[PDB]
Design a protein around this ligand. Structure first.
Ligand SMILES: Cc1cc(=O)oc2cc(O[C@H]3O[C@H](CO)[C@@H](O)[C@H](O)[C@H]3O)ccc12
Ligand SMILES: Cc1cc(=O)oc2cc(O[C@H]3O[C@H](CO)[C@@H](O)[C@H](O)[C@H]3O)ccc12
Ligand SMILES: Cc1cc(=O)oc2cc(O[C@H]3O[C@H](CO)[C@@H](O)[C@H](O)[C@H]3O)ccc12
Ligand SMILES: Cc1cc(=O)oc2cc(O[C@H]3O[C@H](CO)[C@@H](O)[C@H](O)[C@H]3O)ccc12
Ligand SMILES: [Ca+2]
Ligand SMILES: [Ca+2]
Ligand SMILES: [Ca+2]
Ligand SMILES: [Ca+2]
Ligand SMILES: [Mn+2]
Ligand SMILES: [Mn+2]
Ligand SMILES: [Mn+2]
Ligand SMILES: [Mn+2]
Lengths: 237, 237, 237, 237
């Protein structure tokens, strides 16, 4: 199956699969059952920002989610991505709705990856930044119900013309080019991702969440992965 | 056919297609017959550097080629890429040999593209940098006789195991992801490319050259592109 | 005296010193009498953006000023900065009011300078970016009535507590560190600056303008440079 | 006194002040007696590279020193710089010789600092990169015996015309502009530094070392800080 490493912004507490009883951010290493979580005071209708960082020196994947004039939620987990992910991967954003729903709108997204090898001055780097999305964004691979163009934003899940989010939706957006996330001769490897989102929902319990993920190049939405599975995993194991 | 815009480092003077009677750099807008050229004192066996720049404000495509402790060749041409190229393109490097030959080795390559839109703070950017190439470089589309891995270098054309360049060779390397080179609402669009090369022939006259090009997404080596056509054009018109 | 090279956003037409009879942007090379101008449809109370670019290859200084959902004004001028400016300079922003006034608010400012030398891979670079200013901004040299901290903005000229701009005001802000603007050994030397501003006047007819300038390291506000002189020149010659 | 935070590349083991009995890299927080060290297999006459990184999310200062075709030494230390350093500081390089000596040559140096604020898209950044130093480097504050120009290198300590390092030497180089290393409102604060050095010694026992340091803006070489104090501390407490 696909190998997934993700940072989830889980808005709906699914107690049967191990979710805390409140909105939270978590680090998922090949399983929807987060390796570590942190309470997140999600703000309905407000624009938030997520920062994901990682470096091979201290092998720690960290994430911070904040809103203006509000405290930030933080979560970290020590993990050596060399032993989890293949050398070449694709990075993307995923989101879903189930019985309950919310808009999973991405306003901007940027990513940076660097491989600084042993040889003096032998750096390989990739950097992209979208501050507005086009109707025909040829450098993104859109899967599921993901669409671009609506107000220059990226809608991961389906929203009606009147702006109402729909349930039972799932969508993803991966950057077109494969990323060389790590290599053996690298002295220092690292990546950094940032995205701003707008989760708006009429429900008392918005669902299901957004997630930044890294996967094998040919990753695709596992069947029936709407709702609690965030479009990333085929089952809840 | 393909739409090509290229900066050629022409090492062999083909007088029948308009080449000056000496090595030169030139701006090719949809034709192997350069719109403007400049004498280039090519140095066999030495590592050179090429810098290509362009911006929509003053619509001028410029290039500079230099060698350490040597003068640089420069060429410029006013051209509005909006009227020549499609919004989405692919960028790459091309090279060829014919009756005569040379090594068309690329030691490093970097590219940066930015679209500063009308909407304040709405910048879109792409940046990649290869300071060493891998045997399996999944973010490059290699066409023709192009290969990577050899000393961490990109060999656009065929070289034997003993290092000897072969004639009648043609090869290209395009970056995997499509680049949004321009758009109607962009207040400023621009790009910059840089690469270092090592051209060396054991014969009297080297041939045929290296070229940085921008083309339609699905561009492919035209048949008969060997020799004077530098793997870019189907004919000499 | 000081050596000034500036891109002015002139809001008040001073016909005696050569100003066109309308708001305009212009390139000033050591004189308040612009070498080249362009009509600018200034929008009172709206946030605009200015982009200044320059590169030694095609020796052309260009500027673009735009507002969201509006056309942009553009002006260019061929000039070899090597012959005008000293190798080391300071970059900054200047503004003034005279009999009439306006707010000269800077919301953000970024600058990038690069020197690619003859020796392969030998690049020197400087880059700063302020998206919000602090009350104690130690990396800026504030001259005249310039202050920071008010809403995280830079006020080049004096504005009252109630937000009203004052006349007869002049202020500047230079980046603390000297910039190596050019050097003889460079193959390519280039810079790019961007800033967003908010010009507003209740009197309905604003004066005098804002300007991005490059000068000798020890530059200071010439005596009596309020009004038409934009705080850059000592006289109107 | 000055507040110093430094990563030392200690070549001479001073057992009385706590040095291990071999060359090592260490994290010094306000004291020459490192908080944590790591064995470093220094290679006389070879060019090495140092990478220092830090981020406020996981508050860990890490360093890696490597040589081509050789293992790298690594050292990390959890420390919240907010509680140690003032908001505004200066960054620099320091080096010294004592009874024994070595050349403390810096071939290149780059630094990047970013303050990601709570408010969406509010980022402040500073970045400089020197790949060659000039005889008159106006953006560096040279203290002690530090000089630039010699082959486009930075010599932290005194070396004779014939290239021989001298003992009892101490020199520093700080970047001209103050750096906003942190602020309360920042969601993420981080910095990264990289430099390549060439430590060559005539004898089989080099001394004393090179260090990347962060200090209060007005920092200066302490009296009698030659040798084992690396030009950073006034005493060995
Ligand atoms: C007990 C319960 C009450 C409720 O009000 O909604 C519920 C919704 C549930 O789950 C569904 O809605 C959730 C929120 O969309 C999804 O995570 C999940 O995949 C769906 O099966 C499960 C249980 C309940
Ligand atoms: C005049 C001449 C002399 C020669 O010795 O070889 C020659 C080879 C030529 O062309 C071939 O060799 C050239 C160099 O490889 C190519 O540019 C071209 O496409 C090939 O057809 C063209 C002319 C000559
Ligand atoms: C009295 C008067 C009437 C008028 O219509 O315009 C005037 C413009 C003046 O100019 C001053 O105000 C202008 C706008 O504030 C400045 O450009 C200029 O340098 C100042 O001297 C000064 C006086 C007048
Ligand atoms: C072997 C030796 C003999 C001696 O008489 O003094 C010595 C003094 C030393 O110390 C000085 O030289 C050392 C190496 O340069 C420095 O680390 C230290 O700060 C200096 O005081 C080191 C070694 C000796
Ligand atoms: Ca859940
Ligand atoms: Ca030719
Ligand atoms: Ca005027
Ligand atoms: Ca020591
Ligand atoms: Mn969860
Ligand atoms: Mn030609
Ligand atoms: Mn004017
Ligand atoms: Mn020590």
């Amino acid at each position: 199956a696909d190998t997934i490493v993700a940072v989830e912004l889980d808005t709906y507490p699914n107690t049967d699969i191990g979710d805390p009883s409140y909105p939270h951010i978590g680090i998922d290493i090949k399983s929807v059952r987060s390796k570590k979580t942190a309470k997140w005071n999600m703000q309905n209708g407000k624009v938030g920002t997520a920062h994901i960082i990682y470096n091979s020196v201290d092998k720690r994947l960290s994430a911070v989610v904040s809103y203006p004039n509000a405290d930030s939620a933080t979560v970290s987990y020590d993990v050596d991505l060399d032993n989890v992910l293949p050398e070449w991967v694709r990075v993307g954003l995923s989101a879903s709705t189930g019985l309950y729903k919310e808009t999973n709108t991405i306003l901007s997204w940027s990513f940076t990856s660097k491989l600084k090898s042993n040889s003096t001055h032998e750096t390989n780097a990739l950097h992209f930044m979208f501050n507005q999305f086009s109707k025909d964004q040829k450098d993104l691979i859109l899967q599921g119900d993901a669409t671009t163009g609506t107000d220059g934003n990226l809608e991961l899940t389906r929203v009606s013309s009147n702006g109402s989010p729909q349930g039972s939706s799932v969508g993803r957006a991966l950057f077109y080019a494969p990323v060389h996330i790590w290599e053996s001769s690298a002295v220092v490897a690292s990546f950094e991702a940032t995205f701003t989102f707008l989760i708006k929902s009429p429900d008392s319990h918005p669902a299901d969440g957004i997630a930044f993920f890294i996967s094998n190049i040919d990753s695709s939405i596992p069947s029936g992965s709407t709702g609690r599975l965030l479009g990333l995993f085929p089952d809840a194991n």
